[PDB]
């Protein structure tokens, strides 16, 4: 009877949750807490009041960090910015849960951007759309890597994957801002380009810093821009043994330095994928540095050079 | 030319094909392999009277969340089996399974926007969805924390019940709250909360019972199960130090050894009588429902 009473009190009330509980489950996220400038540069064109901008920034910070927590689990990464990955400290289970929890806390923050219902609807849809896009590209990248050689993506396929996986957070941020603006043409194209440059450079530097960075993308088996070029080049030029050796090294998930270095030199001297990628980056970067009529642009370059 | 193809890319929406859609959907399609879930929604609709059309979408949203949460739950519990079939993450890998499951959360979210076009109502439906996914994760988070930090914290029965209100109460309340918000006709939330609690305790109980008369994967997982919480607090209170530690030691083993699993169940059967205490607890919760329609409609 005292039990029924306690049960009645329980089910007629919201779930009990303490600040203590909140702290216990935020451990994986607080650890990774250990680009505001980008939001700021973009606002020079968007003109949102500082308090609304602070919230946009918080939503993006939460999505970005939660994405990395998941990303490192999916990539089996032992390090993130020189420090141990959260999943290795607190475990995969709590890290997945906490990262997913933060996606929804970010969602909750959108309502703090406006009281006006029409705008609200648009903001949520934007948030919903780019999160869908992010998971689509992430899914492809992961599928290509874990089922290799089932699918050898072409350069076109890679770029489409990146438009989703990486362009997703860039467009989310930008689109939220454009929708909130109380103030020319949309900068989505420019942000899409920024995202592509960001990803190819990220892929590039992962190997170049090693050759000149632990080339962890090799250990991971990732279909990076240089690898995608090498695999299509070898197939095309009939370099049968080199093509297969590239596949073989990716499939070893090796941390051996010499093996990673052998692969990088294949990309350097045999397929010339490194120079190809470097030039590719330069081309995309000149496309912005060169549109004097501001076909893409509205201190935007400083950013482009620190994109890393 | 290269400039041109890039120009064509960045000015279009990201490319995504039907074939891409299928690849990402594999881990999910695998768990689809629902009749009692549909039945619960149907039965409740006799009071909400949503127009079939709209009932189907709620049903679709619930199916997505329920299934994606199980894909994630099996990874978090390192479960090898789900309803007798091999778990998704063991076939498609942890990486694709996490991603596909999370993708389905956002697909479910998209379906919410298609329940209504009325602006006020839409906002409430989103807030409902948002709030219960928050609760689900909090609850799941605490359940996982207790298990993975054991023996730092041993919960009491009350802590366990509050955890369940979140972990299991969320999907139940999410379905009910949406339906009540959509109804064109007292809340049934308190009733759905009890359904969820009865649901979780019976799930914990059967996991040990089915095996006692035979996987008891909960032991292998080291779960702070309802019978386990009772046995741990019982031995502490009765000052039975060595029995208390023995339960702790078996759970910490993460053991698949049948004999050791059986040893823990006999502690629960003969020392703390925890399985019988649980049977009784569930029967009392149910009696609350069968015995003036305060909870019932
Ligand atoms: C999809 N994510 C966005 C990363 C962050 C992109 C970004 C967005 C907004 C602001 C700054 C950076 C990419 C993460 C990686 O690039 P990937 O796993 O694809 O190689 P990395 O593991 O190398 O860090
Ligand atoms: C969260 N899950 C489902 C909760 C109830 C799911 C449900 C089913 C149908 C309709 C609504 C909700 C609780 C049960 C578990 O997942 P399972 O024992 O199946 O591994 P766990 O105890 O491990 O957390
Ligand atoms: Mg990564």
UniProtKB/Swiss-Prot annotation, chain A:
Does the record bear Protein transport in its keywords? yes
A Gene Ontology cellular-component term = mitochondrion
Q: Subcellular localization, per the record?
A: Cytoplasm
Q: Which GO terms describe its biological process?
A: farnesyl diphosphate biosynthetic process; geranyl diphosphate biosynthetic process; geranylgeranyl diphosphate biosynthetic process; isoprenoid biosynthetic process; protein transport; terpenoid biosynthetic process
Q: Which Gene3D superfamilies match?
A: Farnesyl Diphosphate Synthase
Report further notes. Answer: Present with 2840 molecules/cell in log phase SD medium.
Function summary: Catalyzes the trans-addition of the 3 molecules of IPP onto DMAPP to form geranylgeranyl pyrophosphate. Required for the membrane attachment of YPT1 and SEC4. May be involved in vesicle trafficking and protein sorting.
What's the protein here called? Geranylgeranyl pyrophosphate synthase BTS1
Can you name the source organism?
Answer: Saccharomyces cerevisiae (strain ATCC 204508 / S288c) (Baker's yeast)
């Amino acid at each position: 009877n005292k039990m029924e009473a306690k049960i009645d009190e329980l089910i007629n009330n919201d779930p009990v949750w303490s600040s203590q509980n909140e702290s216990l489950i935020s451990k994986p996220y607080n650890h990774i807490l250990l680009r505001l400038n980008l939001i700021v540069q973009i606002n020079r064109v968007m003109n949102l009041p500082k308090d609304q901008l602070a919230i946009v920034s918080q939503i993006v910070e939460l999505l970005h960090n939660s994405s990395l927590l998941i990303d490192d689990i999916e990539d089996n990464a032992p390090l993130r910015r020189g420090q141990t990955t959260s999943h290795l400290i607190f475990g995969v289970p709590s890290t997945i849960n906490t990262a997913n929890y933060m996606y929804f806390r970010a969602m909750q923050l959108v309502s703090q951007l406006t009281t006006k219902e029409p705008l609200y609807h648009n903001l949520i849809t934007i948030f919903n759309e780019e999160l869908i896009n992010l998971h689509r590209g992430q899914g492809l990248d992961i599928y290509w890597r874990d089922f290799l050689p089932e699918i050898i993506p072409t350069q076109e396929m890679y770029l489409n994957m990146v438009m989703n996986k990486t362009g997703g957070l860039f467009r989310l941020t930008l689109r939220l801002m454009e929708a909130l603006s109380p103030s020319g043409h949309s900068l989505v194209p420019f942000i899409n380009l920024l995202g592509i440059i960001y990803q190819i450079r990220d892929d590039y530097l992962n190997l170049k810093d090693f050759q000149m960075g632990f080339a962890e993308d090799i250990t991971e088996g990732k279909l990076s821009f240089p690898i995608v070029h090498a695999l299509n080049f070898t197939k095309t030029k009939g370099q049968t043994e080199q093509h297969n050796e590239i596949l073989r090294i990716l499939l070893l998930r090796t941390s051996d330095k010499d093996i990673k270095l052998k692969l990088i030199q294949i990309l350097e001297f045999d397929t010339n994928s490194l120079a190809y990628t470097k030039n590719f980056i330069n081309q995309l970067v000149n496309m912005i540095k060169n549109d004097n009529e501001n076909k893409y642009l509205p201190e935007l370059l400083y950013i482009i050079d620190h994109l890393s």
